[PDB]
Amino acid sequence: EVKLVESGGGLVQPGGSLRLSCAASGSIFSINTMGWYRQTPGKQRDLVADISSGGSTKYGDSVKGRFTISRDNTKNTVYLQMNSLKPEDTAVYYCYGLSYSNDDYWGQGTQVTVSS
Amino acid sequence: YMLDLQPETTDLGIQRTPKIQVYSRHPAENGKSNFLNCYVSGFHPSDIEVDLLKNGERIEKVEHSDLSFSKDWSFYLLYYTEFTPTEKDEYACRVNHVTLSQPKIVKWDRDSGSHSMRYFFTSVSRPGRGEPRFIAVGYVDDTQFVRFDSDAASQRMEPRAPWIEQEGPEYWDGETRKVKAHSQTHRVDLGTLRGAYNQSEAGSHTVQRMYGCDVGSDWRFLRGYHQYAYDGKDYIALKEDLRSWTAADMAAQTTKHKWEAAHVAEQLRAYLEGTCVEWLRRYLENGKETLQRTDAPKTHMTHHAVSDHEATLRCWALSFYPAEITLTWQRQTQDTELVETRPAGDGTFQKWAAVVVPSGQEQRYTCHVQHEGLPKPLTLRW
C-alpha cells in the first residue's frame, strides 16, 4: 500500500557526514512515525532514530549526539543527518514507517560505508 | 530472607524467540481508566526492546516488571502503562530481539494449598560498557515482594509488596548486604566460566541462579532447590535430597568436586530446610490478606463470526488468584485454542480458551472452569 523511497547513502571518510532521506507515498494521513534501523552483523537490526508526525524523536544509544532526525511534514519526508561517522556505523540503513493503525512499512535500505 | 553464605563458598572451580501478548488489565470501557499490557515470555538472552504504540507512535511513560525467568531458564517481562481508550485510538506492542530480523508488532485486539518462596538472580556481562547487569527478585507464590537492580540509584533491596514494608532497617540492611554478595559471586563466576569455556572477552554471557523452598498446606517443608545455569543451559544443580549434585558437562564436574570437598550442600540444606521455611511462614502470616486469599475467576463469553459458517466461541477467565486454572471445551482436545496464563498487573491473572463451532450449533458447546477459588466448577454456555 505504502512505498518508501530512500536516498543519500554511499561511501564517506571517518569524521565525515551523510544525509539520508526517506519519502513515503500515498496520502499524508497514511504514515505517522518514520525513522531508520540499521543491520547488525548478526540477524537483527537496531534502532537508529525515528520521529513522529508531531515531532517526537528517539535515538539509539550508539548514535546519540552525532545523529539528528528531522521532518518535513508537508510531504511526509524525513531526513537523518549522520555526523562524526565511524567504521562501526557501516551497515545497511532501513527506512521504516508506522501507519496510524500500527502497520509497519520497510524500505529496501541504503548501504553506508565508512572508510579506514 | 535470602541465603547468607561466605563469598568463596559458592565459587565456581541456545536462543529463544519471545512470545508476545497485548491486552488490557480490565475489560475496555470508553472513558474508563485502564492499563495496557504487553507480556513477553520464553525468550533468551534477556536483552530485549519493547515499545507500546498508540496510533503509530511511541508511548512516553512505559513501565515494566523486574526481570525473572521460568523453570526452563527463559525470561519473561510485563510492560504496562495507564491509558484511557477512546473510539479512534489503536494500540500495539513492538518487540525487538536478537532472534528477530526486524521488530515484531502485535496489535491490541480490542474486540488450603501449598506455598513457596523463590529467589531469582540474573547477571549479564557488558564488555566495555561497565560492570555486569545484576537483577534479583524474590517471590512468595505468584507475588513478587523484593527486588534489586544494579542500575537503580538506591543500591538497596527494595520492597515490592505492602506486607514486606513493615520490616525494619535491620532487615533491609541485611538483605542489601546479602544481595550484594550474590552479585559479587556472579561477577566472579562470569570471569571463571569465560575461561573455563575458552570464550572471548568481548562477548556477552549470562549467569542465572534460582533457589527456594516449598511447604505444604500444613506449612511443613516439602522440597528445596538450588540451580545454576550458564547462557540458558543447565550447569550445576542440587538434587532433591539436598546432599548430592547434578552436573552437566566437564567444567561442571570440576565445580561438583570442589563443592563436595568444601561441603557446600550442607550449608544450603540448612537454609532451605530451616531458614527458608521459617521466613516463608512469617511472610504468609504478615501478608495473609494478600498471600492467603483466593480470588475467584470473573467469567464471561464472547461470540465472533469468522466465515459466516464457522463461528468462534471464546471462554474468558479474569481477575483470579492464584494462577493455577483449567479451561476445557466440551462438545474436545482438537481445534481448541488455549492461551497462556498472563499477569494482569494488579496481582491477578487472566486466561481464555477458544472453540470454532459451526453456526447454529452454539448451544451444543460447554466451557468448564476449574479453579481452587471456586467451590463448584463452573459450566458456561452461550
Author numbering:
A (entry chain B): 3 to 118
B (entry chain A): 1 to 13, 25 to 122, 143 to 362, 367 to 417
Task: Give the original sentences from the paper that presented this experimental model.
Human MHC class I proteins, or human leukocyte antigens (HLA-I), bind peptides, mostly eight to 14 residues long, for presentation on the cell surface for recognition by cytotoxic immune cells. Success was ultimately achieved by isolating and recombinantly expressing the VHH domain from a novel, high-affinity, anti-β2m camelid antibody, allowing the crystallization of all SCTs tested.
The YML 12-mer peptide loops outward over the central binding pocket, typical of longer peptides (e.g., (29)), with residues p2 and p12 anchoring the peptide across SCT designs (“binding mode 2”).
